[PDB]
């Protein structure tokens, strides 16, 4: 239904149509070269990516400390081959680490009968130790070993001839690195003479072996200045401390203890922890435990928990047991010495089922901290969001941005966030997706109006929100 070959060539071969056809050909082809130049302009004018920082394993989420292998298990099973069994739990916690409270052969207060190299036979054999350590490698749980020498005694470095004790450690670190451990914790460095110098030597020995091993020192200190002094000469030492411990016991000081410390250290890496050893519940009253798990999982740095923090274990709740090493409550059998005292909700089995439980919050947060590039190594901006609220935004370059809102005071807010004076790079949205709340009865997943939000007393929120160029 048109011109034949004959009819077309008798018309469309005219010089006017030839010039028109040439024009349309070159118009199209310069149009495509124009659209290429347009795209090459956009690709140069576009904001370049921000260099992603090379991160050691301990940046990627929580360590986990096991101060007594016996207390973590119940007796008889209290040995390293027992512990090899439990790693599936730890893998459930998404803990990127472990720290086995000292296993070396220490005789109480005896400098000479103590060895930091031979393991105390109660816990097994080096053949067990390696069996564990190899299993943990297989399951992506690095293992640190705690080498604080006189750990069965009163003073953990002994009272005397400290240079011989330092010499024991200097030898020990080499041996156990050769055995394959992922680094070392030492404790009580306030009871060690010339502490900063020995940390410098031991740190050099560790990093000198491999770049992906760490030394966690730990102090009973809560003085900002003493802490900053141990951290002056040593720059990639985690130093766990009592510094966040003195919280005011309705959280009231925390916005300030946290943001001073970040400011003072110059936003280096940190280890957030309420102590060098004892549980969260040694310090926090139980209305805050949820609120601190939301915070320890989302400040810049590697959080550290003792065992059973994830279930809000408490030494006082099952009377008589020592505040050093309370028996871990796996199921209702786990403390048979006063049977029927353990409620279901106090135990791992009893929490594991319930989305509202503490361990269901720990598990969930541990996920976010270990996957999300924003919590993994984002920047941090505190801001004044509200009267009680410790509030801050974690952000990376262009990834998802996370606003954390902790209501530390005992009075609910009824009038929204009202952020004064946000950094211009990090401005709050009109709305943001509630990724979780510390409290039940919230529409998790849904977007919230920040100017008309309502926190309850001690309700923390984790909101997630997308980028804007």
């Amino acid at each position: 239904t048109g011109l034949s070959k004959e009819e077309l060539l008798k018309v469309a071969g005219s010089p006017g149509w030839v010039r028109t056809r040439w024009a349309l050909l070159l118009l199209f082809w310069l149009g495509w070269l124009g659209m290429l130049a347009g795209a090459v302009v956009i690709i140069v004018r576009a904001p370049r990516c921000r260099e992603l920082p090379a991160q050691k394993w301990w940046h990627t989420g929580a360590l986990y400390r096991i101060g007594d292998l016996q207390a973590f298990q119940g007796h008889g099973a209290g040995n390293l081959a027992g512990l090899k069994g439990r790693l599936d739990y730890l893998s459930s916690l998404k803990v990127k680490g472990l720290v086995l409270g000292p296993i070396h052969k220490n005789q109480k207060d005896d400098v000479a009968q103590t060895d930091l190299l031979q393991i105390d036979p109660n816990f097994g054999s080096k053949e067990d130790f390696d069996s564990l350590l190899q299993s943990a490698k297989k399951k992506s749980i690095r293992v640190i070993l705690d080498l604080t020498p006189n750990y069965r005694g009163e003073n953990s470095w002994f009272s005397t001839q400290v240079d011989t004790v330092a010499t024991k450690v200097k030898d020990a670190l080499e041996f156990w690195l050769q055995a394959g451990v992922d680094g070392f914790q030492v404790r009580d460095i306030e009871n060690l003479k010339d502490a900063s110098s020995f940390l410098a030597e031991w740190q050099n020995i560790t990093k000198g072996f491999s770049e992906d091993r760490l030394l966690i020192a730990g102090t009973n200190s809560s003085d900002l200045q003493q802490i900053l002094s141990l951290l002056e000469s040593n720059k990639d030492l985690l130093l766990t401390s009592s510094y966040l411990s003195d919280s005011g016991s309705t959280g009231e000081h925390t916005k300030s203890l946290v943001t001073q410390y970040l400011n003072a250290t110059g936003n280096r890496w940190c280890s957030w922890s309420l102590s060098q050893a004892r549980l969260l519940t040694s310090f926090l009253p139980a209305q805050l435990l949820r609120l601190y798990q939301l915070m320890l999982f989302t400040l810049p740095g590697t959080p550290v928990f003792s065992y059973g923090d994830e279930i809000g274990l408490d030494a006082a709740a099952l009377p008589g047991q020592p505040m050093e090493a309370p028996v871990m409550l796996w199921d209702e059998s786990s403390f048979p010495d006063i049977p029927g005292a353990v409620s279901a909700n106090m135990t791992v089995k009893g929490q594991s089922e319930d989305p509202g439980s503490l361990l269901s919050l720990f598990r969930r947060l541990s996920d976010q901290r270990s996957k999300e590039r924003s919590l993994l190594h984002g920047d941090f901006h505190a801001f004044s969001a509200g009267p009680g609220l410790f509030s801050y935004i974690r952000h990376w370059d262009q990834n998802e941005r996370f606003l954390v809102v902790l209501n530390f005071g005992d009075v609910g807010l009824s009038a929204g966030l009202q952020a004064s004076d946000l950094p211009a790079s990090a401005s709050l949205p009109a709305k943001a997706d509630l990724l979780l709340s510390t409290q039940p009865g919230r529409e998790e997943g849904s977007p919230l109006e920040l100017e008309r939000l309502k926190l309850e007393p001690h309700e923390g929120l984790l909101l997630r929100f997308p980028y804007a160029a």
């Binding site: 070959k5 077309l8 469309a12 056809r21 495509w32 795209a39 576009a46 990516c49 990834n399």
Partner: protein, 454 residues
């Protein structure tokens, strides 16, 4: 003036392996695993979709050597179901299937090609749309200048992507040499694993659009099918094996671009090669689809369903220039879509329903008109198995998604207005006929095109 036959066996295999291998094995390995839950079932739906494709494709070799028209599914439907069914089939492919699938693999080309300028952030949306359009435009122009260009381009990039997939499989083999199934099993969910997997096999039917352009159809159509789809199935299960040796389930479920993570892990400072080859793999498919899509519309115009200009050919080059220019422009309209990857559900529904109808037709025509020649005949079981399988996949996915499938049927039924107006009811004021003719000859004058002869 009519199109010269010049597709060899090798260029036909390059059309199928080139047009299938495509994007699916780079952009969708996550998609099956999110529905299948575990490597044990995920790596199985990759084989299962292979099998369903193989029996469907062989079924297309029977149907194709039977009828031997070009225009594939549409042609074979017209010979069985008649005018209105065949028009609705083609109206769905004119509006949504072949435009959207072209724009989908073009966006993937642009995204993965630009990704080494933007590692660890979103690649700039507007530059990824431009470079998607630059791809479609250049391959339309190549496809208009010479079929001996566009088939050599198909060979070139069919080779390139198999080299890239060889590297990925090889690094898998290296890793497992150096040195399980927690599954959300639900008939209401595994179906969306299959619908995700089958998108990566989409294209076995594409050589059936160029049967009137191969040099020896009765040999090379059924040979190119059965050489091709076993190669594709093998490459796909070995490539998935490679991904699952390198990555955890949680990585593959949460990462944006599986092949990039695989590249990063194995190649470090040299990792940019894997993104670029995923790009070049998509580019090959844009070509293969522009090739086979333009020929569909050319046939639909020849056999009276589609306005006459699209049947015409540029006589100095023998390329179907108004059809290519249409399928091109119709592709670029998909740039005005935000969440375009949504359309893969509509694509998956609409495509296998049309293949179902075609193979119902294969049995029906072999019973109803048994005198027609069968240069290859295979079995009566493979059609029946494929029909009950595809009708299961359709019925069950419909049952799980009535809200989406309902609006889907309005796309189908949107054809009846245009069908009656253009084909059958034919409102015909003589000024309208004068206008359509005047517009047609104007298009002839611009593009210098002549209608098809004998």
């Amino acid at each position: 003036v009519t199109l010269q036959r010049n597709i060899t066996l090798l260029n036909g295999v390059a059309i199928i392996v080139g047009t299938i291998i495509g994007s699916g094995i780079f952009v969708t390995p996550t998609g099956v695993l999110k529905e299948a839950g575990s490597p044990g079932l995920a790596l199985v739906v990759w084989a299962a979709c292979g099998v369903f494709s193989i029996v469907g494709a062989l079924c297309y070799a029977e149907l194709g050597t039977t009828i031997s028209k070009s225009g594939g599914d549409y042609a074979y439907m017209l010979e069985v179901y008649g005018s209105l069914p065949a028009f609705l089939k083609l109206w769905i492919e004119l509006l949504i299937i072949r435009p959207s699938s072209q724009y989908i693999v073009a966006l993937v080309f642009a995204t993965y090609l630009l990704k080494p300028l933007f590692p660890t952030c979103p690649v700039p949306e507007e530059a990824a749309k431009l470079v998607a359009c630059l791809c479609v435009l250049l391959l339309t122009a190549v496809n208009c200048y010479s079929v001996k260009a566009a088939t050599r381009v198909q060979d070139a990039f069919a080779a390139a992507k198999l080299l890239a997939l060889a590297l990925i499989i090889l690094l898998g083999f290296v890793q497992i040499g150096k040195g399980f199934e927690g599954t959300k099993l639900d008939v209401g969910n595994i179906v969306l694993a299959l619908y995700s997997g089958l998108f990566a096999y989409g294209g076995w039917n594409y050589l059936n659009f160029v049967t009137e352009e191969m040099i020896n159809p009765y040999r090379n159509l059924p040979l190119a099918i059965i050489i091709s789809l076993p190669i594709v199935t093998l490459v796909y299960v070995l490539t998935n094996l490679a991904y699952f040796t390198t990555l955890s389930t949680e990585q593959m479920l949460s990462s944006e671009a599986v092949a990039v993570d695989f590249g990063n892990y194995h190649l470090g400072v040299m990792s940019w090669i894997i993104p670029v080859f995923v790009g070049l793999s998509c580019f090959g498919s844009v070509n293969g689809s522009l090739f086979t899509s333009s020929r569909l519309f050319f046939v639909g115009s020849r056999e009276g369903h589609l306005p006459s200009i699209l049947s015409m050919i540029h006589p100095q080059l023998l390329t179907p220039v108004p059809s290519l220019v249409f399928t091109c422009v119709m592709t670029l309209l998909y740039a005005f879509s935000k969440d375009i990857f949504s359309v893969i559900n509509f694509f998956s529904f609409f495509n296998w329903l049309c293949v179902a109808l075609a193979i119902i037709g294969m049995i029906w025509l072999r019973h109803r008109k048994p005198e027609l020649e069968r240069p290859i005949k295979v079995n009566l079981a493979l059609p029946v198995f494929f029909i009950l399988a595809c009708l299961f996949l359709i019925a069950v996915s419909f049952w799980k998604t009535p809200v989406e499938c309902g609006i889907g049927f309005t796309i189908i039924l949107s054809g009846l207005p245009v069908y009656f107006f253009g084909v059958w009811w034919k409102n015909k004021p003589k000024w309208l006929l004068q206008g359509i003719f005047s517009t047609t000859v104007l298009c002839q004058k611009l593009m210098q095109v002549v209608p098809q002869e004998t």
